[PDB]
Amino acid sequence: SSIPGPGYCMGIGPLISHGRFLWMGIGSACNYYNRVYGEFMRVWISGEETLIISKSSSMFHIMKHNHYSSRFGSKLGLQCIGMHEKGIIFNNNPELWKTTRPFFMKALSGPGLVRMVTVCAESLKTHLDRLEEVTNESGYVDVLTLLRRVMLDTSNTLFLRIPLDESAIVVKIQGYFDAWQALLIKPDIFFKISWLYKKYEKSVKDLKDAIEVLIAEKRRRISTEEKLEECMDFATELILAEKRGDLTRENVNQCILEMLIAAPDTMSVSLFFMLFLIAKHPNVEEAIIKEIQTVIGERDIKIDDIQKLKVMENFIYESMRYQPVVDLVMRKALEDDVIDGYPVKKGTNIILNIGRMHRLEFFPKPNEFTLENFAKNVPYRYFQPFGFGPRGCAGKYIAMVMMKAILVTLLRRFHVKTLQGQCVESIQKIHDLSLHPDETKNMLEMIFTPRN
Ligand code: HEM
Ligand SMILES: C[C@]12CCC(=O)C=C1CC[C@@H]1[C@@H]2CC[C@]2(C)C(=O)CC[C@@H]12
């Protein structure tokens, strides 16, 4: 077959291509190349060869096998954000990731997934009763900040539960993600011109220190406590492993940070896009309101309710399909392999353009938002919003629950209006790492009006 992509020009090929990624941003850079060349094609970030693939069959082969259970990134960029062989998200040491992941997996399923449905609802209730902290004079709600605040609140009360400053931390987290996003594929030259990179080294330290205060108190509380087996929360589980010397304090500290940011980083942006889609799609809103009245009514939301919320479940999926936030997945080849009739050496970086994949394959009406796409049960080998197998999203289950929870408890109480002209398609979007809205532009607010 042989491998498609731009020409090697001795040092130039890898320089224009890396440049293209730094200029446009990973998201749009990937779409570019996919659109120009094949759905399977080669590029260069830093020195290293990297493939950018939207072929559903390649995606499936890659996520399924254990020998793609790695990601990649600037070592110096990762060391800076403290993800270099520490958390799980970009922990690329196979032996440390293999031993760390279990803690996340356990915390994000079973009993904790059941509490989460009832804790998302409470934390949103408490914040909808406090709308005065996010609403404009002309009645504009800052949906983004609201969603981040609750998300953080939920994550905290479930995984750490130490009193913190919601408002402050959300900003710090917001900065950290920006740092993470920037430094992730910066070439090494970047890390010499300091009055250029240490804008970020700041955001990182600010969050890292803010948390070191919380993990400090959680340690104090544990040392004395109430004899352990209350509900072993993520944070405890970790500290006790650290205490048995299964983990190092550095590792534990990063893990907690990674858990607290994951929700606000992605859920808020996802739900924000969803609320924007609900506004501009009135017939769908009725469907969801009916389904709510049928299944839940005026009752509190409980775990048993969530399986029956099928219309909503299909809205949620169709939203992530049509307007993804996490539209690309970074992986690394650990062994030699033929991948859809292509030679893939170990050490080859991979970007899985799962956003473009949800447009080009399977779906009846791939290029418009309709629950038509999910009218017939979807194979999942054709639809990967979270990924799967050894290294798929750790919260892939708890997320789906949380979104149902907070959508119900919102749409229950409020009709949601988009600002005059606005819709998701006409929003300034940064397409790099994640696909989030441009927050320097504006009219990203919404109007909450009661249902009755
Ligand atoms: C709701 C929107 C979310 C989306 C679309 C999403 C999607 C993804 C995707 C596509 C990956 C890449 C997995 C792979 O390599 O196949 C991932 C990784 C991950 N996600 Fe999610 N996720 C979401 C929410 C969450 C939440 C709420 C949490 C935790 C509370 C979470 C925790 C993680 C972690 C820890 C990883 C790294 C897994 C690893 O490499 O070990 N995600 N996510
Ligand atoms: C879901 C996630 C982790 C939790 C978090 O804090 C925020 C994000 C957003 C970016 C995701 C990332 C997981 C790894 C992903 C899928 C990649 O390989 C490229 C983009 C990136």
Side-chain angles (χ1 to χ4, degrees):
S1 274
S2 183
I3 188 76
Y8 196 170
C9 294
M10 165 62 254
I12 275 294
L15 248 183
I16 66 99
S17 84
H18 192 154
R20 208 137 192 73
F21 269 83
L22 292 170
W23 179 251
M24 307 168 75
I26 304 168
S28 64
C30 286
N31 263 296
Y32 176 75
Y33 283 110
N34 256 145
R35 216 182 57 255
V36 179
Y37 314 79
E39 296 325 288
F40 196 120
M41 67 81 68
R42 188 271 337 276
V43 157
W44 304 269
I45 303 156
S46 300
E48 46 218 27
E49 285 189 50
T50 126
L51 310 168
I52 85 103
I53 305 151
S54 73
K55 256 286 185 69
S56 144
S57 55
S58 279
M59 174 279 299
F60 184 85
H61 180 268
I62 286 170
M63 306 207 302
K64 165 206 171 69
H65 287 304
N66 280 296
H67 65 278
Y68 305 106
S69 302
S70 173
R71 311 202 187 266
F72 63 95
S74 167
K75 182 198 174 158
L76 280 77
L78 288 166
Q79 253 153 335
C80 197
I81 54 180
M83 285 192 186
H84 181 62
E85 306 190 321
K86 274 202 283 151
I88 40 166
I89 304 161
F90 279 95
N91 185 330
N92 293 321
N93 181 253
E95 223 57 60
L96 211 83
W97 170 80
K98 213 79 198 265
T99 62
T100 304
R101 171 144 177 150
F103 295 84
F104 280 80
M105 292 306 310
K106 199 215 184 183
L108 300 166
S109 70
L113 190 144
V114 173
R115 270 271 317 278
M116 182 59 90
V117 78
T118 208
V119 174
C120 249
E122 285 331 302
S123 168
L124 177 57
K125 276 179 187 172
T126 203
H127 280 36
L128 288 181
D129 286 0
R130 234 158 296 268
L131 244 347
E132 75 259 8
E133 300 201 60
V134 208
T135 325
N136 200 37
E137 174 56 39
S138 55
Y140 304 158
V141 284
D142 174 14
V143 166
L144 256 319
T145 308
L146 174 74
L147 286 187
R148 292 207 179 86
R149 288 216 172 103
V150 31
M151 250 39 270
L152 175 66
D153 184 17
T154 345
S155 300
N156 182 17
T157 51
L158 204 47
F159 307 117
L160 171 63
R161 21 98 148 217
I162 293 296
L164 55 81
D165 174 352
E166 265 185 48
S167 325
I169 303 292
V170 175
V171 151
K172 271 89 156 301
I173 285 169
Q174 183 63 337
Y176 179 88
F177 179 83
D178 279 12
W180 173 15
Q181 165 152 355
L183 310 172
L184 203 273
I185 52 146
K186 291 297 146 78
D188 299 307
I189 334 160
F190 187 93
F191 296 87
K192 278 314 296 282
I193 355 186
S194 74
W195 72 96
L196 164 64
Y197 79 65
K198 68 194 171 200
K199 203 225 321 298
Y200 304 123
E201 218 161 72
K202 256 269 280 158
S203 327
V204 174
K205 200 186 71 71
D206 267 73
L207 182 65
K208 191 130 270 174
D209 302 344
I211 293 168
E212 246 85 315
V213 167
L214 310 179
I215 57 93
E217 168 78 331
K218 186 72 177 199
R219 290 208 162 89
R220 277 187 226 109
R221 293 195 191 186
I222 281 169
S223 72
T224 54
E225 206 91 304
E226 205 188 32
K227 287 312 300 295
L228 314 171
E229 51 258 288
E230 273 41 65
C231 63
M232 290 267 279
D233 50 50
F234 182 61
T236 298
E237 281 265 307
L238 286 173
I239 290 159
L240 296 192
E242 205 236 275
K243 231 213 77 154
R244 295 187 290 273
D246 301 321
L247 261 39
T248 47
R249 173 202 24 83
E250 281 306 6
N251 198 349
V252 172
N253 284 12
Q254 176 67 7
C255 278
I256 291 175
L257 148 29
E258 286 199 2
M259 185 69 92
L260 290 190
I261 69 165
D265 275 348
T266 38
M267 293 265 282
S268 69
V269 189
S270 260
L271 296 152
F272 170 75
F273 278 153
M274 275 146 54
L275 288 173
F276 246 76
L277 280 146
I278 261 164
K280 284 303 200 220
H281 292 273
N283 44 334
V284 171
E285 182 167 5
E286 271 185 4
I288 298 165
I289 297 303
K290 283 332 279 277
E291 192 184 47
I292 290 166
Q293 293 169 325
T294 308
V295 183
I296 305 152
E298 88 285 49
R299 198 205 311 146
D300 273 318
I301 181 90
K302 258 91 219 296
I303 179 72
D304 318 286
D305 296 296
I306 83 97
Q307 292 84 356
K308 296 171 230 140
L309 298 168
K310 177 53 178 248
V311 192
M312 162 147 24
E313 186 195 300
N314 272 216
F315 163 71
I316 297 180
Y317 290 153
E318 177 52 17
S319 293
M320 319 189 94
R321 185 200 74 68
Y322 183 61
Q323 196 57 245
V325 165
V326 195
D327 85 292
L328 43 91
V329 182
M330 286 164 69
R331 297 293 194 100
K332 195 168 161 61
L334 299 162
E335 309 285 15
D336 284 346
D337 211 330
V338 162
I339 209 294
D340 272 3
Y342 284 94
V344 176
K345 257 142 42 59
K346 92 164 174 186
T348 310
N349 292 160
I350 297 160
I351 300 172
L352 282 175
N353 196 350
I354 70 176
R356 192 168 145 95
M357 189 198 81
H358 292 149
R359 292 296 230 257
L360 272 55
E361 293 218 20
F362 181 91
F363 293 100
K365 291 147 188 180
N367 277 291
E368 43 143 333
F369 182 90
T370 24
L371 299 196
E372 311 257 327
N373 290 301
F374 287 75
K376 296 283 214 166
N377 186 90
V378 283
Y380 104 49
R381 83 129 269 160
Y382 292 115
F383 181 56
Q384 284 305 169
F386 300 102
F388 75 104
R391 195 153 203 170
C393 173
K396 76 183 278 164
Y397 297 122
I398 197 157
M400 280 300 309
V401 151
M402 287 192 273
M403 288 186 282
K404 279 182 198 197
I406 76 90
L407 275 198
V408 155
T409 32
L410 222 196
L411 304 156
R412 177 111 67 95
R413 191 171 168 180
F414 295 105
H415 188 105
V416 286
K417 246 85 54 57
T418 172
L419 243 53
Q420 201 83 192
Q422 310 307 139
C423 61
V424 281
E425 298 83 354
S426 56
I427 290 176
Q428 223 92 79
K429 272 116 75 183
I430 292 177
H431 205 163
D432 178 53
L433 216 234
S434 61
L435 180 56
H436 54 283
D438 205 332
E439 297 211 61
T440 52
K441 283 65 212 283
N442 42 61
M443 285 191 76
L444 293 177
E445 283 83 22
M446 309 211 327
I447 303 148
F448 295 168
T449 54
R451 293 225 92 88
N452 286 13

